[PDB]
Amino acid sequence: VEQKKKRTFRKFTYRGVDLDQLLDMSYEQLMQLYSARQRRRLSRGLRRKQHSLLKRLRKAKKEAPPMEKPEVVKTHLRDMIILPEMVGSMVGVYNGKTFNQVEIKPEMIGHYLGEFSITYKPVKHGRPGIGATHSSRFIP
Amino acid sequence: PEKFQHILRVLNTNIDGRRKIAFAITAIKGVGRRYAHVVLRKADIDLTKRAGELTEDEVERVITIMQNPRQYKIPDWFLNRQKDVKDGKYSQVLANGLDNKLREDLERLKKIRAHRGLRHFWGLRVRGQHTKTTGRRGRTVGVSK
Amino acid sequence: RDKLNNLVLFDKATYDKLCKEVPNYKLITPAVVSERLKIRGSLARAALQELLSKGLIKLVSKHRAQVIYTRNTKG
RNA sequence: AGCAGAGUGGCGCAGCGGAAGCGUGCUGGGCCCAUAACCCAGAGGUCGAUGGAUCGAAACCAUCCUCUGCUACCA
RNA sequence: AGCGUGUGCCUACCCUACGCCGGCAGGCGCGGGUAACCCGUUGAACCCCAUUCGUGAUGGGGAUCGGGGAUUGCAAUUAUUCCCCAUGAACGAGGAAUUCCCAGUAAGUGCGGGUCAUAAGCUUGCGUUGAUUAAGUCCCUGCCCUUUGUACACACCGCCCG
RNA sequence: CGAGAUGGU
């Protein structure tokens, strides 16, 4: 990663804990660090057949060459919360017609996968057409 | 009267010593009507006097209470920074510290390029609002060719 | 565009005038005291209660939105 | 060299010792079923250098700079 | 105050008193109602009485934006709705134009019904406080009837000349 | 007795 200190030692962490500690914590402990929406989702959420993504991610983390990035796993699951299991991983997130790849930085923790893959193009205007103003009227 | 000093400087900001004490200290950023009343109530100050009628040790009692709310038993549910994301603390942030705390929050969203960080960067409405008919700040454009 | 500059506390040049002017006025009210002495309405409210306990003026009427006072029963 | 103009705030014409000046052009709105005529509102603002009176300087007054205009010459 | 609604017949959800925990949104327990029977004497808002501010873009105004907590749901990010501390824009009664209204009316003020798993700045009803100005005209925009003129009948937004 | 031209569906 580009930056020192973060989640490793001293004053930059998540909520006061290090990445190696977030990797020891259970879902029952971890839901005290997350905010109210993520806490409700983990408390209520049986996650029935949503564990399949976590299996494919941990397969790709296991089988990658030593000191090189995993291959992409590509998915429709835009409403998945980023767990501390998912850091340093490649995901392709569906956009309504294409998959956009994401390298999951540890600062992304507690966000949704769908927050990093955007459904539209930023607008830039062409000149106004006929009917755009009351004076614009056409007579043959 | 005593012809005492009627402008005073408190936290790198100037207070008019001429308003009621509970409405003079809200010239500090991070101190609203609701928080200013509770600080003076813990500080044991009479709310009826003008801000130029406080003695030198009374202003130091108010300043030392504003900077350490949790040791004078001001509740956690009152504070403007709750579980701060990088170190987990609870506090009230004031003056030029509030400017930097927002400056760090907008750059933290931009660095990972989340949707919030892109809307703040392009200068668009960040919360759920529509943009077809409100917030207009350009110039009228003519149809002619 | 303009500004008033009304006082928040007295000084002797205006406090001695408050005590000298009492017999001159048929109608005494916080607003007429405010504009005539250049005093805020909250100081005008406070000053007229002291003169009443000193016995120098008569209360004619009181209501939330309007007090009225007058000269001490002669002239 | 004699005498005069310019040195935009919006193309263009340059008012008078008060921070647009008015006729006009551009852009938008009203009126009408609709187009013209008519009516109304907009346009990010030390206007070449150096001194002096002013509440004030493109616009009251010095001294330099440059190009035009009419005369007409240091060339 | 007055008008109303209430356990959904496939379709799976209703209206709530009382006690206890919490600043709040909210949570747990335990009863009544298929309704002139229970929520309910439906303790509504403006208004009324007392206090503080003092002509200041101010203690007027509350847009924009940071952080945290609950509830619906299979799922809330492009923020469902709700609660808390903080931030504190334009705006000082609005140019040419233009809408609605004659008495329990206009305007002010809050409450039900619809849509509804979650939810009114809309709409359709109800009560409460309660004026100023008129009792007329055909001028402007239109409608009805009669006499009259026409080169119109696609009917004046017509037809037609150099 | 102010000024009052014109007409793709």
Distance CA A97, CA A78 (A): 13
Chain A stretch 10-69, residues whose beta carbon is closer than 8 A to a beta carbon of chain B: 11-17
The parent domain of residue C33 ranges over: 1-75
Domain of B28, CATH number, reads: 1.10.8.50
- Preceding-residue numbers of gaps in chain C (C–N over 2.5 Å): none
* Contact by Cβ (8 Å): B39, B46: no
B13 & B45 share domain: yes
Total of domains in chain B: 2
Q: For C10, which of B1, B18, B50 is closest by C-beta distance?
A: B1
Distance CA B145, CA B130 (A): 30
Distance CA A66, CA C60 (A): 96
* Contact by Cβ (8 Å): C10, B1: yes
B45 & B83 share domain: no
Q: For A132, which of B83, B113, B143 is closest by C-beta distance?
A: B143
Proximity of residue A100 CB to strand E below 7 A: no
In a domain, B145, yes or no: no
Technique employed here was cryo-EM
The parent domain of residue B70 ranges over: 1-75
Query: Is residue A116 less than 8 Å (CB to CB) from chain B?
Result: yes
* Lookup: tokens for B87: 């170190």
CA torsion sign, B122 to B124 to B127 to B130?
Answer: negative
> What DSSP state is assigned to residue C51?
H
Mutate to test the interface with A, among B77, B83, B91, B115 (most CBs of A within 10 A): B115
CB contact under 8 A, A11 and B87: yes
Chains B and C form CB pairs within 8 A to the count of 7
Total of domains in chain C: 1
Resolution (Å) of this entry: 2.9
* Lookup: tokens for B140: 């009228």
Q: Which residue is nearest to nucleotide E56 (CA to C1')?
A: C3
Q: Which uninterrupted H or E stretch holds C16?
A: helix C12-21
